[PDB]
Design a protein around this ligand. Sequence first.
Ligand SMILES: Nc1nc2c(ncn2[C@@H]2O[C@H](COP(=O)(O)OP(=O)(O)OP(=O)(O)O)[C@@H](O)[C@H]2O)c(=O)[nH]1
Ligand SMILES: Nc1ncnc2c1ncn2[C@@H]1O[C@H](COP(=O)(O)OP(=O)(O)CP(=O)(O)O)[C@@H](O)[C@H]1O
Ligand SMILES: Nc1nc2c(ncn2[C@@H]2O[C@H](COP(=O)(O)OP(=O)(O)O)[C@@H](O)[C@H]2O)c(=O)[nH]1
Ligand SMILES: CCCCNc1cc2c(cn1)[nH]c1ccccc12
Ligand SMILES: [Ca+2]
Ligand SMILES: [Mg+2]
Ligand SMILES: [Mg+2]
Lengths: 54, 334, 427, 437
Amino acid sequence: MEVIELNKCTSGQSFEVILKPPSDPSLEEIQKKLEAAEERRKYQEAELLKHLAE
Amino acid sequence: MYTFVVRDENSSVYAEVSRLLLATGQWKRLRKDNPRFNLMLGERNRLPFGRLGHEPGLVQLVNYYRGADKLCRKASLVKLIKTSPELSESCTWFPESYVIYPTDEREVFLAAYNRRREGREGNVWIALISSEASELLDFIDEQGQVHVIQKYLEKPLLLEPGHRKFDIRSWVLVDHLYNIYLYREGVLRTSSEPYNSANFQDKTCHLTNHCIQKNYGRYEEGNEMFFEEFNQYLMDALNTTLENSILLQIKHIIRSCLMCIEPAISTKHLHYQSFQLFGFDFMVDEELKVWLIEVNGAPACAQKLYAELCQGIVDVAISSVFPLATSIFIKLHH
Amino acid sequence: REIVHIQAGQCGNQIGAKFWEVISDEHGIDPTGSYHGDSDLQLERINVYYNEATGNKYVPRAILVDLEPGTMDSVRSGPFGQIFRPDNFVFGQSGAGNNWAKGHYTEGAELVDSVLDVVRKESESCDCLQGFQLTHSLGGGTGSGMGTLLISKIREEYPDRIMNTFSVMPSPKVSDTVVEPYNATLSVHQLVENTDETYCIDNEALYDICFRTLKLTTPTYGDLNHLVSATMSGVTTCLRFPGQLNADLRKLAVNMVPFPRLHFFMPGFAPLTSRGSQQYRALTVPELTQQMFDSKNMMAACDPRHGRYLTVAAIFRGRMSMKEVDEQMLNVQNKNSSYFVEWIPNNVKTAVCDIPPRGLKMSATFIGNSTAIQELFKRISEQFTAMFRRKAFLHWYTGEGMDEMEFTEAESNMNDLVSEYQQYQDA
Amino acid sequence: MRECISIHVGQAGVQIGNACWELYCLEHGIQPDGQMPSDKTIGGGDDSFNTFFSETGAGKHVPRAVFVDLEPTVIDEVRTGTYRQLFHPEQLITGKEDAANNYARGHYTIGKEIIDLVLDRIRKLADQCTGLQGFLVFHSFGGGTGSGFTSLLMERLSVDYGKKSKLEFSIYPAPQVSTAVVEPYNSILTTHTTLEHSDCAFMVDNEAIYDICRRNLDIERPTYTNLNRLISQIVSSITASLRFDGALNVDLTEFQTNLVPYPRIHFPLATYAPVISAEKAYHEQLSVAEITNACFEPANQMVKCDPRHGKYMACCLLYRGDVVPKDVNAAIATIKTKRSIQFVDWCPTGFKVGINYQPPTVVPGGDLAKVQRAVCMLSNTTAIAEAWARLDHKFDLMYAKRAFVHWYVGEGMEEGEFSEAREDMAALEKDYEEVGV
Ligand SMILES: Nc1nc2c(ncn2[C@@H]2O[C@H](COP(=O)(O)OP(=O)(O)OP(=O)(O)O)[C@@H](O)[C@H]2O)c(=O)[nH]1
Ligand SMILES: Nc1ncnc2c1ncn2[C@@H]1O[C@H](COP(=O)(O)OP(=O)(O)CP(=O)(O)O)[C@@H](O)[C@H]1O
Ligand SMILES: Nc1nc2c(ncn2[C@@H]2O[C@H](COP(=O)(O)OP(=O)(O)O)[C@@H](O)[C@H]2O)c(=O)[nH]1
Ligand SMILES: CCCCNc1cc2c(cn1)[nH]c1ccccc12
Ligand SMILES: [Ca+2]
Ligand SMILES: [Mg+2]
Ligand SMILES: [Mg+2]
């Protein structure tokens, strides 16, 4: 019904039609998160090499 | 060899259907959470429609129409009729009703309540039954949940011998093509007590539920008169048939209700398909005018008609989609 | 995406030899190492198994290991015997005498370092090593004993590399000695820990197939190896030829192995064909699918109906309607959804390759991760106990330094493997 | 003029990026060598297309894009593709080993060894920007890279570019074209970690694109090339307003404003029509009313779901071709009376319309037929939550048994991150339900 904000140009045109009105983490924390997981790998790899050593 | 699942054990109807399907030897029952099913006899609450039709190489079907609760809830049905132009606020086969929340449209109800009394005309309403508004306007608050108030039919048709009240139950099936099939065999769920205008506080005389009644089993077995008898009674007592005097209005109301919500629930172009069995409850006044009382989304059948109805469900609503290696339904065309 | 092949023992080297004989023919490589194909598809993914050498010659990235020179001398004088890099022939002289202890602790230990030098030599040349594969039996001494010693030492020097095996299981129907259950149990303990994928090739199944199905009165080890070479070619098709599947060994293992210990697969193949006996009638897709899921086509003598599929992989080869493939694959699952776990969504995956194997217009290879594989281990465990309860034939092992306790442990770990399989079967 | 940088991550992201940039070049008349004859401002300028292309003194037009994969074979097809001349070597970043469909491996393990490099190569582009709006990130949910490395990248961009916006084009996992089985894990994981770092995300279910290609393009079994060419058309529609003159969705900020009232619920549903087969010999061209009406058919949606059983928060109509406002309002008025379109009470029931007179450009030899007029509807409906429900259910089934979990834990991840992510998804599903009913 109500057409508004009609803008026209050579490339085309745009508008709005209304039918009815209404009714972050830091670099620190990341680089530690990535390293706390690298320590868990190193530990898992260690317990493997220790197991293989036995 | 098709496959199905069952997720509602309390279902009297589909429990019989699940057995019929197995008896053919062309269907298999999987477990509750096996997604590789052709058919689903789902639960009543929180049925996961969002997970249907996403199994590659499997036509999926379910025995429930998503969004059909708008017709099967009392608060929703009133809103559906008043808001929808299809049915309109001037709807003639639905009692004048109003939605009332506990402490909405309360002030409008009182506006209509007045001139009803200030006009020398009968005025009784139902949520319980009372002639005074303030009586049970506080009742609804002391229950907790939302109810609906509507005009009580003070002039109901009365079955003789007995001078008795009754209500009609019709079973309607809507398949995947939204064909509306009316089951030819309905049932009158009658009261064995004589209707009494003088006192509404007693409800055995005003309410016709199947469990309330259990003078039981006096006139008809289990307080259930079928069409063959009720038809014969009308012919002898009123010189008319069931088809003419009542059923035309029933077929009209059924079709009108479902046609109204067809665009909101239809699975015509969807990735999964739906069918559903409904139970419409009608009321007849002394002038043979049919009124809609409610719609039941998970109806239970009558014992005699279980075998015939459940077989019908398999014929047109399941095998129509999953074929295998004189009709008990009247099709309401549109 | 280079793979390093190792073959240990009599069995390992004979199926391994036939493996290279088959895929070298598929990749158009001749017994000298020269390419002579009709397509560029044969050379596109050929770096995976072959090293490109001078004169545009292709050399298998293969290491041939044994404790006696008998079998490897036969390989070298075999059909494709000269394709192999002579330096990769690493052998002893004493043999292992079907003794796991000899292969794992004494005779093999003396030789294992020599083998690893060759492994390292190959691994270093690899642009990006994606894993190792081993062919061996578990009922002998070298392949069983030394092969698992190799795997242990490889995981030590390459802890982040995929290790897969094609392991031939021993059966009384096809038996060299009575101590095969002993060598097998000791080996399975090793495989449960240090492999990502083990293809369980039961000699019982291979025998029955050759007999009950393939119309062969008395099958030889050569007849049994036709089935193994066919299967091995089948499972590596996606790795060897360009297709829809962009997967290295790791990614493949991720989607097949829901639990680390449960990585023992039932291989299958269709159509089943005996040596020489030509195939005139090409199978329809419904027939390939129906056959590759039938127990009679399984290479592990287990009944799939006595268990449930954790995951499944199927590799169709040839020119066919992959729409029909999808339908037939999606069919089987929906006919028998009870034999698939419901708690791993979409656990059946399929891949297609346009080039079929030699002799067949189209074929299917089955890789099943079923819990029914416990039947295989329960069988070995019974044969094991039957002797161990009397400590029979144990002197052959205690003579090489082993203690009875090590047998009790191996026994226990496999009975645990069985119960672990039974856990997910009842879920 | 303000620039936008496109980041293509993983196999899906890269191959889709190629489909898009191929399409952009054809639309803007740019050639495979990067020469754009119609551009008279040699060596620079601030036109609308410069939002996506930089310029060199030699007259080459270069995509403001960076391709990244942990494995080279897919990006190698770009290095030697028909548009090899278009890109610069430092725009194409490859690793050696992929993430093997493992989020933890793409995020933690291998991601860590390459994150600083990508950021540097991204910074190389941002330095060539007079005014950077933000980033367009293309990737898959299912891949270990597309999920794992993406969330890591998204986290950092919010640190190095706090102000800048970040949009997502996300491929939602479909078994029909997927070989993986752990994609539900990867999807939930990357969604959880990326949610606070993404302003607006356009999901695309391969299931939907697959069936559209079968149903409407008569392709018996779509390849990725089929899917990607169709996806590029949708993306092109959505980015057209950033590359062409207009007043609707001119910057990335406006996408959030117009489509995302609530930050967490930033997954608009895209619907595209008409999709017509090039092999369709005789085709009756469809009208504005017909194609607009198709925007409310689930069979045309990027994600299969039922908007009727949900509530809208916003709705944009983006037309390409012979369209005028008169015919659109007529179509809207007609469709409104016949279909179920319920908005939230705190939003106006209306549409923002954008029309570009240039009809949709088609790839020569492609599967799509030229059309006189086409449309892409961007509707933020709560009905898209069905896709989360599907995904979350598959997650629960597997995780209850801890299936495959050992693969992630073995890369340094903790079992607790599974439940953290799943909890975040449980919250998201609930948010959708608060608004939707
Ligand atoms: N539409 C579309 N989907 C794709 C394409 N390529 C991959 N996918 C989907 O992406 C998912 C797998 O993720 P990929 O992008 O292939 O993997 P990746 O990002 O390279 O990550 P890794 O290989 O595990 O390191 C599957 O569900 C595929 O269906 C593509 O070109 N187009
Ligand atoms: N407006 C009205 N006038 C007269 N009687 C009414 C009425 N509304 C309800 N009743 C009586 O109430 C009985 C049951 O009420 P209602 O059916 O609304 O609740 P219900 O849903 O628990 C039973 P069912 O679901 O099986 O129909 C009917 O049998 C009818 O006789
Ligand atoms: N399929 C097959 N099995 C074999 C072959 N040779 C031996 N076996 C099996 O392997 C076991 C003997 O192991 P073997 O390889 O000879 O011992 P090794 O040489 O010391 O490693 C027995 O169970 C045999 O059935 C063979 O050529 N083919
Ligand atoms: C020597 C290593 C043999 C190959 N292993 C392998 C192959 C596949 C797999 C797991 N492992 N999953 C698949 C799914 C489809 C097609 C092929 C495979
Ligand atoms: Ca310029
Ligand atoms: Mg021997
Ligand atoms: Mg990849």
